[PDB]
Amino acid sequence: SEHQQYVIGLFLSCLYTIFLFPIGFVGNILILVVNISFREKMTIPDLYFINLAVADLILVADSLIEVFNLHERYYDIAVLCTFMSLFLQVNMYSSVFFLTWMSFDRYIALARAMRCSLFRTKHHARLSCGLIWMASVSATLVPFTAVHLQHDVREVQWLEVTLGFIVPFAIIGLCYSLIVRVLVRAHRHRRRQKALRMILAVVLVFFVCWLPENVFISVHLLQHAHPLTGHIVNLAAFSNSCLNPLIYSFLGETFRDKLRLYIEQK
Amino acid sequence: TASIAQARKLVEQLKMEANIDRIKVSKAAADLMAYCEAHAKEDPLLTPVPASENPFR
Amino acid sequence: EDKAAVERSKMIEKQLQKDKQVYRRTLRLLLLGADNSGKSTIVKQMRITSGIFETKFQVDKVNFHMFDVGAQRDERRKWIQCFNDVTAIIFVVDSSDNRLQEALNDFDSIWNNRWLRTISVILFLNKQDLLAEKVLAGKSKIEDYFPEFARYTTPEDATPEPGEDPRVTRAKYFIRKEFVDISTASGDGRHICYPHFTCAVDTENARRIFNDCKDIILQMNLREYNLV
Amino acid sequence: VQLVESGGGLVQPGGSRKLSCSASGFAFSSFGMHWVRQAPEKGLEWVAYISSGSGTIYYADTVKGRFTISRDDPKNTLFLQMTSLRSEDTAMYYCVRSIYYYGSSPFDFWGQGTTLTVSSDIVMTQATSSVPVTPGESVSISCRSSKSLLHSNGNTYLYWFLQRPGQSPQLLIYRMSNLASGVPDRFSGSGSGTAFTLTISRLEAEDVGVYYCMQHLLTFGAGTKLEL
Amino acid sequence: ELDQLRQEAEQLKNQIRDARKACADATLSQITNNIDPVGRIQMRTRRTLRGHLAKIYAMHWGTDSRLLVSASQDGKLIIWDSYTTNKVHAIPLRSSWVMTCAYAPSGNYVACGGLDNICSIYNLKTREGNVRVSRELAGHTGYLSCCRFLDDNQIVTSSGDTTCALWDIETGQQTTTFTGHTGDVMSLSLAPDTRLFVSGACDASAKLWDVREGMCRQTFTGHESDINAICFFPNGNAFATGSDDATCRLFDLRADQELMTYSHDNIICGITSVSFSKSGRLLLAGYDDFNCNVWDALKADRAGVLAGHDNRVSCLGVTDDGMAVATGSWDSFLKIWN
């Protein structure tokens, strides 16, 4: 199956740009513009939402190029290709790390609000955003420089699978399983159904979106030349950045009320 | 009983309020406008001052 | 030179930061209640013309400030706007006394207040042992003051204290029902009410307050993080 | 309010000694402190300065790197440590209080002083060495400065001090027009930003002394000796 | 006897109302129809004085028009150097619940008070070099709403106990007491000559007092709700008011009746603060809707908006020099507009 295989690939590509891409793009830009127009009213979670929106907006903008295989136009340009690949990798790492760090910050806030008040200062929130960006830049540029000075490499791909899914997913699962333990006990004694199902949704979305790409990469690494699987897993990976604005930001009452305030006043 | 003092002092205050002289509202409005016209040039907020004289910027 | 003044301002700013680190670690509670209640006994039992009275106590290494507004006029329309942004309001009522309708009206006024629409209320139905004694004696019927009690029946979801007269359970749960109905029928989501039965002899009021405040800041953070 | 120094023992050339100041009666923590020396039978000279909180330290080039100034704020004590005493260092050392904020009056209080006996910058000049006078008449003292002390802020950082025979200097006027606390209204000051004059409306025998002018844009004038 | 006294009271009230009606032969709006408008008054935030840990409840300018004292509910007074944003002093208060502050005309003292029912005078200029409490005026049986200095020796305060008193700071006991309000006295304004002062109360009326005779000269009853703020017109012959009614009123003492009302149907929230401009042609007002509006005192048509505050604008004042307007809010920030 070649003709129908390409047809179904194009069908998946078109479905993505019709359904998910508008969500990703518009929701991310809307979150960013609202939380910037309300710079004075910005809370600590708003910093993380802004940073994650920036990362996901860049990632979805790049994904539109992979859509319909427009990447074939420029890959041969060495410097441009290297810059684009590094800028994509740093943004993927930043999205993963910001989700992971937001999970830990949510755990600290929900489970230790009255004891960890010394932490969770807006200064520390900005510092953590900067450090997360620096960590993503390091994770991208360190192996790149090492390989190129010494000489896609096996060890770099193993590092990517470790720092992109394994550790981030372990942290996210642990933190959200502890938040669920706190919420089930609190709700048992004295509306948190919405919180429980949102916490389920975020982790399920992360797992579903990021597992296929990393499994596909690990398959090669255990042994690109697998036409349709590559497209399907790439689309799955981009769906996470498309959906993050939905699940994380405007599915909750707080951001929706903030959006109403923005609409009425600006 | 106790309200008798309150009532008497209320009516006493009312006599003083009534016996006070009054002037027509037109003269009052004229006086206020006269003050505003006389001191308009001395109000930095009403008329912005040159940017060099602004002590703040 | 002005640089010395700038240095002085920086020193003052450092002191202000060191003070903010204490301001943000403290939970402020407002204690309200009619004089017939036992709020004085409650505040005295906190073994860690002047107007405001402040009591400080600590539970599990978190600091609480409990403000009792002693010497003011009967009306509280204006001075209560200052107590916006407090962690919770501790409302105390003498459940054994009936003055209960005035307490109901006062609680209705506090609950339906413009400036206290996000402030959760911790309701201490104080002097419950006196109510139990009153019911056991049967000298007076609660039905006369509240006609609804003639047809009220205790719910199945109740959590009766072991060794309790069924009539005492019915009366106490009816009185709790009055306040919880007032709370639920006029506001939702933004703030919650936490009824509690207590007596002056009790030593668990600090733990009650600590648990309710824990839940209150849990909900506050949950809202802050867009989870509700 | 009292500032009492300690030390002042004999030192051989090339030796070392530490002077100490004990502060009492005022909030030493929030006062910048200066060391001002006075060589025998001549004018003052500024030695060192340590700001409140020890955030800033300055020295004169005569001692830069040879002296060291430190303050023990919890014990309200100020120290000046000298490593190599020269014959030029022989002088009486005063400790001067100074607080900097809008409207303050720095250099207001001076210590008692101790005698240490041992075996470009602004030029401030007072051409008149002495001025015979009598009680009841007015007299004027003048000074000049290389730069114009009138800063862009509008303030003219010119200070006047009086040293009665056998006392430490006392602040008369700060910033060229403001009388210090406790100074009688008989004194006045003025200047064009580069030339300044100090005037006593009516003289009394208690006004006899040496008048110094200091710029704070820290050099002292040679001094003028009023005699009667 | 009670019925007869009530009859006499209503007779006197009718007489006063009829006299005020007779004196109303014109309206300020009718008279001011000819004067040119002020245009649109655009102001921008020249400074943002931040550092208060909680809601800012009050502020006051010094007579030098540079230093201003600011009070916050966390228990701090900070004297700012508005020209440079520097903090001159930071005074920790005994009572966290401070609702008013004042700056002495000479600049030597500041005062504050609140729910503790005590006015505390602080000595800014002392030999010890630190701000020290000089006197704690007690005697009010209710929270303290406002306090203003007549002089370094005398201070007049209003309290929620429906009374206003004049204190001698030296001896520390009330020189005279003013009574007659039937509700919490929420604001107090001192006449420029400092011979009369007007206080607004929750009973929806404003009274003109004589600080030396101790009796009210006349009363004004134009509002329908609590009067939250009051300010004298610079000439001293008129004063403006602000109330929960979401409107301002301008009364004249000589005419003894209201002259103009400032309100727009699109404003529904109460007014927290009021103050005229130096010439009196503008009437700034703070609102609960997080922004302040500038009203033309003569035309009575809104002439601008000062919208830079995240939360309630709780305090507001204009320099004696007239160069700037300060506006404190529950956001904990204090901004100078120009």
Coordinates of N, CA, C and O in Angstrom, one line a residue, chain E residues 173-252:
Chain E
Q173 N -5.2 65.2 76.9 CA -6.6 65.0 77.3 C -7.5 65.9 76.4 O -7.0 67.0 76.0
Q174 N -8.7 65.5 76.1 CA -9.6 66.2 75.2 C -9.8 67.6 75.7 O -10.3 67.8 76.9
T175 N -9.5 68.6 74.9 CA -9.9 70.0 75.2 C -11.4 70.2 75.1 O -12.0 70.8 76.0
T176 N -12.0 69.7 74.0 CA -13.4 69.9 73.8 C -13.9 68.7 73.0 O -13.1 68.1 72.2
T177 N -15.2 68.4 73.1 CA -15.8 67.3 72.4 C -17.0 67.8 71.6 O -17.8 68.7 72.0
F178 N -17.1 67.3 70.3 CA -18.2 67.6 69.4 C -19.1 66.4 69.3 O -18.6 65.3 69.1
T179 N -20.4 66.7 69.5 CA -21.4 65.6 69.5 C -22.6 66.1 68.6 O -22.8 67.3 68.5
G180 N -23.4 65.1 68.1 CA -24.5 65.4 67.3 C -24.7 64.5 66.2 O -25.9 64.3 65.7
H181 N -23.7 63.8 65.7 CA -23.8 62.8 64.7 C -24.5 61.6 65.3 O -24.2 61.2 66.4
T182 N -25.4 61.0 64.5 CA -26.0 59.7 64.9 C -25.5 58.5 64.2 O -26.2 57.6 63.9
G183 N -24.2 58.5 63.9 CA -23.5 57.4 63.3 C -22.0 57.6 63.3 O -21.5 58.6 63.7
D184 N -21.3 56.6 62.8 CA -19.9 56.6 62.7 C -19.5 57.8 61.9 O -19.9 58.0 60.8
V185 N -18.5 58.6 62.4 CA -18.0 59.8 61.7 C -16.9 59.2 60.8 O -15.8 58.8 61.3
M186 N -17.1 59.3 59.5 CA -16.2 58.5 58.6 C -15.0 59.4 58.1 O -14.0 58.8 57.7
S187 N -15.2 60.7 58.0 CA -14.2 61.5 57.5 C -14.3 62.9 58.1 O -15.3 63.3 58.7
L188 N -13.1 63.6 58.1 CA -13.0 64.9 58.7 C -12.1 65.8 57.8 O -11.0 65.3 57.4
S189 N -12.5 67.1 57.6 CA -11.7 68.0 56.8 C -11.5 69.3 57.6 O -12.5 69.8 58.2
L190 N -10.3 69.8 57.6 CA -10.0 71.0 58.3 C -10.0 72.3 57.4 O -9.4 72.2 56.3
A191 N -10.6 73.3 57.9 CA -10.7 74.5 57.0 C -9.3 75.1 56.9 O -8.4 75.0 57.8
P192 N -9.0 75.8 55.8 CA -7.7 76.4 55.6 C -7.3 77.3 56.7 O -6.1 77.4 57.1
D193 N -8.2 78.1 57.2 CA -7.9 79.0 58.4 C -7.8 78.3 59.7 O -7.4 78.8 60.7
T194 N -8.3 77.0 59.7 CA -8.2 76.2 60.9 C -9.0 76.8 62.1 O -8.6 76.7 63.2
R195 N -10.2 77.4 61.7 CA -11.2 77.8 62.7 C -12.4 77.0 62.6 O -13.2 77.0 63.6
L196 N -12.7 76.3 61.5 CA -13.8 75.4 61.4 C -13.4 74.1 60.7 O -12.4 74.0 60.0
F197 N -14.1 73.0 61.0 CA -13.9 71.8 60.3 C -15.2 71.1 60.1 O -16.2 71.2 60.9
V198 N -15.3 70.3 59.0 CA -16.6 69.6 58.6 C -16.3 68.1 58.7 O -15.2 67.6 58.3
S199 N -17.2 67.4 59.2 CA -17.1 65.9 59.3 C -18.4 65.3 58.7 O -19.5 65.7 58.9
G200 N -18.1 64.2 57.9 CA -19.2 63.4 57.4 C -19.3 62.1 58.2 O -18.3 61.6 58.7
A201 N -20.6 61.7 58.3 CA -20.9 60.5 59.1 C -21.8 59.6 58.4 O -22.4 59.9 57.4
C202 N -21.8 58.3 58.9 CA -22.7 57.3 58.3 C -24.1 57.6 58.3 O -24.9 57.0 57.6
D203 N -24.5 58.6 59.1 CA -25.9 59.1 59.2 C -26.3 59.9 58.0 O -27.4 60.5 57.9
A204 N -25.4 60.0 57.0 CA -25.7 60.6 55.7 C -25.9 62.1 55.8 O -26.6 62.8 55.0
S205 N -25.2 62.8 56.8 CA -25.2 64.2 56.9 C -23.8 64.7 57.3 O -23.0 64.0 57.8
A206 N -23.5 66.0 56.9 CA -22.3 66.6 57.2 C -22.6 67.9 58.1 O -23.5 68.6 57.8
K207 N -21.7 68.1 59.0 CA -21.9 69.2 60.0 C -20.7 70.1 60.0 O -19.5 69.6 59.9
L208 N -20.9 71.4 60.2 CA -19.9 72.4 60.3 C -19.6 72.7 61.8 O -20.6 73.2 62.4
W209 N -18.4 72.4 62.2 CA -18.1 72.6 63.6 C -17.3 73.9 63.9 O -16.6 74.4 62.9
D210 N -17.3 74.4 65.1 CA -16.4 75.5 65.5 C -15.5 74.9 66.6 O -15.9 74.6 67.7
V211 N -14.2 74.8 66.2 CA -13.2 74.2 67.1 C -13.1 74.8 68.4 O -12.6 74.2 69.4
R212 N -13.4 76.1 68.5 CA -13.2 76.8 69.8 C -14.5 77.0 70.6 O -14.5 77.2 71.8
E213 N -15.7 77.0 69.9 CA -17.0 77.1 70.6 C -17.6 75.7 70.9 O -18.4 75.6 71.8
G214 N -17.1 74.7 70.2 CA -17.6 73.3 70.5 C -19.0 73.0 70.1 O -19.6 72.1 70.7
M215 N -19.6 73.7 69.2 CA -21.0 73.5 68.7 C -21.0 73.6 67.2 O -20.3 74.3 66.6
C216 N -21.9 72.8 66.7 CA -22.2 72.7 65.2 C -22.9 74.0 64.8 O -23.8 74.5 65.5
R217 N -22.4 74.6 63.7 CA -23.0 75.8 63.2 C -24.2 75.5 62.3 O -25.2 76.2 62.4
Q218 N -24.0 74.6 61.4 CA -25.1 74.2 60.5 C -24.8 72.8 60.0 O -23.7 72.3 60.1
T219 N -25.9 72.1 59.5 CA -25.8 70.7 59.0 C -26.3 70.6 57.6 O -27.2 71.4 57.2
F220 N -25.8 69.7 56.9 CA -26.1 69.5 55.5 C -26.5 68.0 55.3 O -25.9 67.1 55.8
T221 N -27.7 67.9 54.5 CA -28.3 66.6 54.4 C -28.7 66.2 53.0 O -29.8 65.8 52.7
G222 N -27.7 66.4 52.1 CA -28.0 66.1 50.7 C -27.9 64.7 50.2 O -28.5 64.3 49.3
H223 N -27.1 63.9 50.9 CA -26.8 62.5 50.5 C -27.9 61.6 51.0 O -28.7 61.9 51.8
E224 N -27.9 60.4 50.4 CA -28.8 59.3 50.7 C -28.1 58.1 51.4 O -28.8 57.2 51.8
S225 N -26.8 58.2 51.5 CA -26.0 57.1 52.1 C -24.9 57.6 53.0 O -24.8 58.8 53.3
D226 N -24.0 56.7 53.3 CA -22.9 57.0 54.2 C -21.9 57.9 53.5 O -21.6 57.7 52.3
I227 N -21.4 58.9 54.2 CA -20.4 59.8 53.6 C -19.0 59.3 53.9 O -18.6 59.3 55.1
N228 N -18.3 58.9 52.9 CA -17.0 58.2 53.2 C -15.8 59.2 53.1 O -14.8 58.9 53.7
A229 N -16.0 60.4 52.5 CA -14.9 61.3 52.3 C -15.5 62.7 52.3 O -16.6 62.9 52.0
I230 N -14.6 63.7 52.7 CA -15.0 65.1 52.7 C -13.7 65.9 52.5 O -12.7 65.6 53.0
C231 N -13.9 67.1 51.8 CA -12.7 68.0 51.6 C -13.3 69.4 51.5 O -14.3 69.6 50.9
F232 N -12.5 70.3 52.0 CA -12.8 71.7 51.8 C -12.4 72.3 50.5 O -11.3 71.9 50.0
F233 N -13.2 73.2 49.9 CA -12.8 73.9 48.8 C -11.7 74.9 49.1 O -11.7 75.4 50.2
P234 N -10.8 75.1 48.2 CA -9.6 76.0 48.7 C -10.0 77.3 49.2 O -9.4 77.8 50.2
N235 N -11.1 78.0 48.7 CA -11.5 79.2 49.2 C -12.0 79.1 50.7 O -12.0 80.1 51.4
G236 N -12.4 77.9 51.1 CA -12.9 77.7 52.4 C -14.3 78.0 52.7 O -14.8 77.9 53.8
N237 N -15.1 78.4 51.6 CA -16.5 78.7 51.7 C -17.4 77.6 51.2 O -18.6 77.7 51.2
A238 N -16.8 76.4 50.7 CA -17.5 75.3 50.2 C -16.7 74.0 50.4 O -15.5 74.1 50.6
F239 N -17.4 72.9 50.4 CA -16.8 71.6 50.6 C -17.5 70.6 49.8 O -18.7 70.6 49.6
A240 N -16.8 69.6 49.3 CA -17.3 68.5 48.6 C -17.4 67.3 49.4 O -16.7 67.1 50.5
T241 N -18.2 66.3 49.0 CA -18.5 65.1 49.8 C -18.5 63.9 48.8 O -18.7 64.0 47.6
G242 N -18.2 62.7 49.4 CA -18.3 61.5 48.6 C -19.0 60.5 49.5 O -18.8 60.4 50.7
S243 N -19.9 59.6 48.9 CA -20.7 58.7 49.7 C -20.8 57.4 48.9 O -20.4 57.2 47.8
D244 N -21.4 56.4 49.6 CA -21.7 55.1 49.0 C -22.7 55.2 47.9 O -22.9 54.3 47.1
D245 N -23.4 56.3 47.9 CA -24.4 56.6 46.8 C -23.7 56.7 45.4 O -24.5 56.7 44.4
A246 N -22.4 56.6 45.4 CA -21.7 56.7 44.1 C -21.8 58.0 43.5 O -21.7 58.2 42.2
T247 N -22.0 59.1 44.3 CA -22.0 60.4 43.8 C -21.3 61.4 44.8 O -21.2 61.0 45.9
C248 N -20.9 62.5 44.3 CA -20.4 63.6 45.1 C -21.4 64.7 45.1 O -22.2 64.9 44.2
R249 N -21.3 65.5 46.1 CA -22.1 66.8 46.3 C -21.2 67.9 46.7 O -20.2 67.7 47.4
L250 N -21.5 69.1 46.2 CA -20.7 70.3 46.6 C -21.7 71.3 47.4 O -22.6 71.8 46.8
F251 N -21.4 71.5 48.6 CA -22.1 72.4 49.5 C -21.4 73.7 49.7 O -20.1 73.7 49.7
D252 N -22.1 74.7 49.9 CA -21.5 76.0 50.3 C -22.0 76.4 51.6 O -23.2 76.3 51.9

